[PDB]
């Protein structure tokens, strides 16, 4: 009666979840775009209608790949640069006390030492200016990293400015993108499209604040793997940015010292004029409005009658306790204590100043035994950036109290990538199919 | 709601349509199947893309469907694999759902197809012997 | 100057002959298409040679001329592409000149061939359904 038989179809539109290796595409830099394929001027996006997919941002494999590639590129860029092995010598340091304000008292050290030269049977006597965070007493001081490892000096021609990067899948694979607004990075997505390459993503490195990111199109978005658990960080995405202006106003001077055949070390010669600390400015009314939006959104998940507290960080290393970033090649660590300090109960031109410190010996990623020396920059430096999200963590959270306390977090940089690759996934096509049909060969 | 035409020319545009409607755009999907930190990734991607196409073509050719996009055979449809009618399959369901339901019984069909093709080849050679 | 035979058994010996004469030595060209500083170059060369051959084979197989060196199809010759007669093409021109002349209108013919092959496959399946 049925008399049905098997029939084979090739080219069927069916896909399955898979893990593969994506490659780079971009339109001297640490994030090398030289070996990246050129991007098409008009990328093709194919909208799929009546396709509901499953998405999960907390198990994406693209984040791990991006982290690995970023680390590999960072390591590769530092290979052809000077190694500061001779710099591990006894320094004789004194205090600098000319034209210094009250808040930069003892923050700089004038250190003299002996150094090698091009000829290997001669020595020279030189001096430089060091930050108090880079020297440890052994009137005699030494660099902090001497008892751990010697590290290279960053080459002064490679720039740390982020560049957008597009991630493209191989042939036989496809990238699905969720176009559904108000999507919290987990569950069904009803509006889906297929794209060839991911949009430009800047590898911005920062903690406690997301800078130069992407803004939500509808409202403030709050995401978390398990909001009931206190061990999971909360990602906040603003619908509008908050402008922040950071500056180092010291007029620095750079001088080169020849420490060998074709090897130079760039020391800080002197400061011309007054000596004042670097600092950042952020508007007050805008921050208050943003915090009002954030607490309004938080009340949805944490009740409509709770009291929401914003407080200071707990403690630990300077990297996880302070807003750390890189502006103009100089590594800033700012004290974000005036921002997260308030309490909200259910019911003009001034700005907040964050004082910041500058560091030169950098352990960029959470590794041990590989530091990096940043050469000094000449002249004052100023930068302006957007704030487009936060990384928060809930303190305590037991039922003994009816209050919620949130503090800034960070540490791991994967969360910086996770805020951009939350609406993407990769699948592999399966064109072969078998069906019943009234054929007969 | 009834009596409206739909035509798709995208890569995976017909993914959301029924099996019958989606079976008219196989070629567009067929075209795409083939086509220092970054160079090795590119090479590995190229090799991986090459391998699977050859595997699929070998599997297609072993069954006697080489060079065909809609090839049908002599193996009958065992009722134990499915019990629905053609009306409720080709005009009500989608390829993704069909694959999700039928993924359990694929290797048996593949082996039966291989054996049937081998027997057909032997019979054809025997007939041509005369 | 007339009534003389020419036969070529070289790789590209027939490159300078007419299209009709050159169409009798396709196999000799078909054979060759497949086959620390230097090893990587060799590997990349091998990969590229494999990729181009696979692309060509896929393109040939999509049109329905799989496993064939000469294969005419159902698509009519639009007069807009060319206006010469067969006497002045196959006996008064070379393949290089023809390729130089026709290179502007290559993709349209490919798309028409693919669509015609898909329609023919669907019609064959419909006929075999009975």
């Amino acid at each position, epitope marked *: 009666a049925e008399n049905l038989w098997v029939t084979v179809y090739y080219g069927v539109p069916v896909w399955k979840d898979a893990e593969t290796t994506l490659f780079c595409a971009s339109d001297h830099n640490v994030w090398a775009t030289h070996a990246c394929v050129p991007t098409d001027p008009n990328p*093709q*996006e*194919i*909208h799929l*209608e009546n396709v509901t997919e499953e998405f999960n941002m907390w198990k994406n494999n693209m984040v791990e790949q991006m982290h690995t590639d970023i680390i590999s590129l960072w390591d590769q860029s530092l290979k052809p640069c000077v190694k500061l092995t001779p710099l591990c010598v006894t320094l004789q340091c004194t205090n600098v006390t000319n034209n210094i304000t009250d808040d930069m008292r003892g923050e700089l050290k004038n250190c003299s030492f002996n150094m090698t030269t091009e000829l290997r049977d001669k020595k020279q006597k030189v001096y430089s200016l060091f930050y108090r965070l880079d020297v440890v007493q052994i009137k005699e001081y030494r660099l902090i990293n001497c008892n751990t490892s010697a590290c290279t000096q960053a080459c002064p021609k490679v720039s740390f400015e982020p560049i957008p990067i597009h991630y493209c899948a191989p042939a036989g694979f496809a990238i699905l993108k969720c176009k559904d607004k108000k999507f919290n990075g987990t569950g069904p997505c009803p509006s889906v499209s297929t794209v060839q390459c991911t949009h430009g993503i800047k590898p911005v490195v920062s903690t406690q604040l997301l800078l130069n990111g992407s803004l939500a199109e509808e409202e403030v978005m709050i995401r978390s793997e398990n909001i009931t658990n206190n061990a999971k960080n909360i990602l906040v995405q603003f619908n509008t940015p908050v402008q922040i202006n950071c500056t180092r106003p010291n007029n620095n001077t750079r001088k080169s010292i020849r420490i060998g055949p074709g090897q130079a070390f760039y020391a800080t010669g002197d400061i011309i004029g007054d000596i004042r600390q670097a600092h950042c400015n952020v508007s007050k009314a805008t921050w208050n409005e943003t915090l009002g939006k954030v607490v309004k959104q938080l009340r949805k998940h944490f009740g409509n009658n709770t009291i929401i507290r914003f407080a200071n960080s707990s403690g630990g290393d300077l990297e996880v306790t302070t807003h750390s970033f890189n502006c103009g090649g100089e590594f800033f660590y700012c004290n974000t204590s005036g921002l997260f300090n308030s309490t909200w109960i259910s019911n003009s031109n001034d700005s907040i100043t964050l004082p910041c410190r500058i560091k030169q010996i950098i352990n960029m990623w959470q590794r041990i035994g590989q530091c990096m020396y940043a050469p000094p920059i000449q002249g004052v430096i100023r930068c302006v950036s957007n704030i487009t999200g936060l990384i928060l963590t809930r303190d305590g959270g037991s039922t003994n109290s009816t209050t919620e306390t949130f503090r800034p977090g960070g540490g791991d940089m994967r969360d910086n990538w996770r805020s951009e690759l939350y609406k993407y996934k990769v699948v592999k096509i399966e064109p072969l199919g078998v069906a019943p049909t009234r054929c007969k060969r | *709601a*009834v*009596g*409206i*035409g*739909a*035509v*798709f*020319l*995208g*890569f995976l*545009g017909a993914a959301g349509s029924t099996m*019958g*409607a989606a079976s*008219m755009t196989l070629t567009v999907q067929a075209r795409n199947l083939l086509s220092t930190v970054w160079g090795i990734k590119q090479l590995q991607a190229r090799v991986l893309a090459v391998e699977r196409y050859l595997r699929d073509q070998q599997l297609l050719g072993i069954w006697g469907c080489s060079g065909k996009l809609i090839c049908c055979t002599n193996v009958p449809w065992n009722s134990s694999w499915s019990n629905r009618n053609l009306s409720e399959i*080709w*005009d009500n369901m989608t390829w993704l759902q069909w694959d999700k339901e039928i993924s359990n019984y694929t290797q048996i069909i593949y082996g039966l197809l291989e054996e049937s093709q081998n027997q057909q080849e032997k019979n054809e050679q025997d007939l041509l012997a005369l | 100057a007339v009534g003389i035979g020419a036969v070529f058994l070289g790789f590209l010996g027939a490159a300078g002959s007419t299209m009709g004469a050159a169409s009798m030595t396709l196999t000799v060209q078909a054979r060759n298409l497949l086959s620390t500083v230097w090893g990587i170059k060799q590997l990349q060369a091998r990969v590229l040679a494999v990729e181009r051959y696979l692309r060509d084979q896929q393109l040939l197989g999509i049109w329905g001329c799989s496993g064939k060196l000469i294969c005419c199809t159902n698509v009519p010759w639009n007069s807009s592409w060319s206006n010469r007669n067969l006497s002045e093409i196959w006996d008064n021109m070379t393949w290089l000149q023809w390729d130089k002349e026709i290179s502007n209108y290559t993709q349209i013919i490919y798309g028409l061939l693919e*669509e015609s092959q898909n*329609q023919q496959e*669907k*019609n064959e399946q419909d006929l075999l359904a009975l």
Partner: antibody
Amino acid sequence: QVWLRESGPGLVKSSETLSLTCAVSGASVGGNYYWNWIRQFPGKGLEWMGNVHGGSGNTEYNPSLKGRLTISRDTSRGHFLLHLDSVTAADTAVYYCSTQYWRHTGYDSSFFDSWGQGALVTVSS
Amino acid sequence: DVQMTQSPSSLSASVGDRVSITCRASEDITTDLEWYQQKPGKAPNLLIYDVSSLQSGVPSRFSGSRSGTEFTLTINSLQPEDFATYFCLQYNSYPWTFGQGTKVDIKR
């Protein structure tokens, strides 16, 4: 754009079988299209008669015309035919062949409508 | 069969006036309704589809609205080329049924 042209005899005697043809240019009859046959009586409104699907071949007819109306396709010749048995004087009308379809060109989507000029058929002995 | 009922059967309007024509159905058809225009001696031309979606090339003066089982075609500013017979076509369920037609004449 899909072009449709009607053709057939201008006169059919009573009780005979009216045969009409609609030729399609610019599109394949075997594609995922719905081809509809409609008629307009003189000095009256339109009346949809039937339609056919190019791919599967299923035909849907009006209940009033059921039992005497047939619609068939021809992919090789690229046209579809209509047959109406036992035509009477009340069947005089202008017949049209039309088609509606959504075109989903990747990102974009567009609704397309096509009609033919139509053919006048008069039934009388 | 779902029955289309058009109103008014005939109307007269001048240039630039506002005209409204109603079509009622025996049962709900959701959105699958179309408004067609037919000039004398010419085949019908689609004016509006999906209740309130305008066909390409149709002037924006035409509009469509729905209220329950009733639908309305509204011409805000009638033009000399807008004099024709308008029909409502339902295709939610078979058989497709047309309206009785409304003829718009010239008032002078």
